[PDB]
Design an enzyme around this catalytic site. Structure first.
Site, mmCIF file in Angstrom:
data_model
loop_
_atom_site.group_PDB
_atom_site.id
_atom_site.type_symbol
_atom_site.label_atom_id
_atom_site.label_comp_id
_atom_site.label_asym_id
_atom_site.label_seq_id
_atom_site.Cartn_x
_atom_site.Cartn_y
_atom_site.Cartn_z
ATOM 1 N N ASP A 35 0.819 -1.208 0.000
ATOM 2 C CA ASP A 35 0.000 0.000 0.000
ATOM 3 C C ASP A 35 0.857 1.265 0.000
ATOM 4 O O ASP A 35 1.413 1.636 1.033
ATOM 5 C CB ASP A 35 -0.937 -0.031 1.221
ATOM 6 C CG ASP A 35 -1.848 1.182 1.317
ATOM 7 O OD1 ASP A 35 -1.949 1.952 0.344
ATOM 8 O OD2 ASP A 35 -2.485 1.345 2.388
ATOM 9 N N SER A 199 -0.859 15.904 -11.621
ATOM 10 C CA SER A 199 -1.118 15.548 -13.008
ATOM 11 C C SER A 199 -1.388 16.809 -13.803
ATOM 12 O O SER A 199 -1.949 17.776 -13.298
ATOM 13 C CB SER A 199 -2.301 14.584 -13.127
ATOM 14 O OG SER A 199 -2.784 14.552 -14.457
#
Length: 330
Positions: A35, A199
């Site tokens: 994770d 992004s």
């Protein structure tokens, strides 16, 4: 040194991935959920409340000659999905894919919430976010990657998740045969403890690319792709019959639909998520309503590049002094 381990979807939807991990002496192999969105390595164990164990493989520290109680240490963690676990702490030897750390904090679960109990395929989590998020008290502990870092040929790990297929976690090296083209690296903020990056925008299907900064985290521990409501609405508007359902808990769409792809930007580069990756099947057995793989982050408080996005790429987690993230197509 290096390590390389195969990671395998737990079910037919890729809801999560498990990777075999060797703990203790002799080795006890547990299948853990790697994770990058948390920083605790914790396991079902011989200490876990018996009613809360249902098919998982447990770590028994009393059977390990290298296990030592970390005296006084406890841990307790809650995840974004509402699940939780807690217990005490041992140090022991931990190996992933041939890579060995001695003295790793192995957090032994005394309690786990129902969703963990109900998932017999996951024996625990191996956190790969920054050690600053580790919950061990009173002495915070280091992640497996943090402990391994200085011994690694290069201070990196890579996530290469498969779509309905096995993939690979590599430690200490970049497999140049595992991707196509070049790797685009982008800046990371560690300020919240995550692999947090920005992004450069998105496109829906064959649509024009929208330049816009989207701050979010690269999180292998999250199934879906969570983005701002504007973006998510723009995507689902291209699917006839798609709607957000308060009763179901997100966007659903007719199972008869063909989904468009979704592109996200990494600097000047582009990662394309095929539409098939965004299909998570009937909301209930036999239903003709299907659950979407792109959902709104509103009310999460952060955008999450989960497995839906990450499995479309070869992803480099660069833990150099100035950490960065790399993305390649594959």
């Amino acid at each position: 040194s290096t390590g390389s381990a195969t990671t395998t979807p737990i079910d037919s939807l890729d809801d999560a991935y498990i990777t075999p991990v060797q703990i203790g002496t002799p080795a006890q192999t547990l299948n853990l959920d790697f994770d990058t969105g948390s920083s605790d390595l914790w396991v079902f164990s011989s200490e876990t409340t018996a009613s809360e164990v249902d098919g998982q493989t447990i770590y028994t520290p009393s059977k390990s000659t290298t296990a030592k109680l970390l005296s006084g240490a406890t841990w307790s963690i809650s995840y974004g999905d509402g699940s939780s676990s807690s217990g005490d702490v041992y140090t022991d030897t931990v190996s992933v894919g041939g890579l060995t750390v001695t003295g790793q904090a192995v957090e032994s679960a005394k309690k786990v919430s129902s969703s963990f109990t109900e998932d017999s395929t996951i024996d625990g989590l191996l956190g790969l976010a920054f050690s600053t998020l580790n919950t061990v008290s009173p002495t915070q502990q280091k992640t497996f990657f943090d402990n391994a870092k200085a011994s690694l040929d290069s201070p990196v790990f890579t996530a290469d998740l498969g779509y309905h297929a096995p993939g690979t976690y590599n430690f200490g090296f970049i497999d140049t045969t595992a991707y196509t083209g070049s790797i685009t690296y982008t800046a990371v903020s560690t300020k919240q403890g995550f692999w947090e990056w920005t992004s450069t925008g998105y496109a829906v299907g064959s649509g024009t690319f929208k330049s816009t900064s989207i701050d979010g985290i690269a999180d292998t521990g999250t199934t879906l792709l969570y983005l701002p409501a504007t973006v998510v609405s723009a995507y689902w508007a291209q699917v006839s019959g798609a709607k957000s359902s308060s009763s179901v808990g997100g966007y659903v769409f007719p199972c008869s639909a063909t989904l468009p792809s979704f592109t996200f930007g990494v600097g000047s580069a582009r990662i394309v998520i095929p539409g098939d990756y965004i299909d998570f099947g009937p909301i209930s057995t036999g239903s003709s309503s299907c659950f979407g793989g792109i959902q709104s982050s509103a009310g999460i408080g952060i955008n999450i590049f989960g497995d839906v996005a990450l499995k479309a790429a070869f992803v480099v987690f660069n833990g150099a002094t100035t950490p960065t993230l790399g993305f390649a197509s594959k």
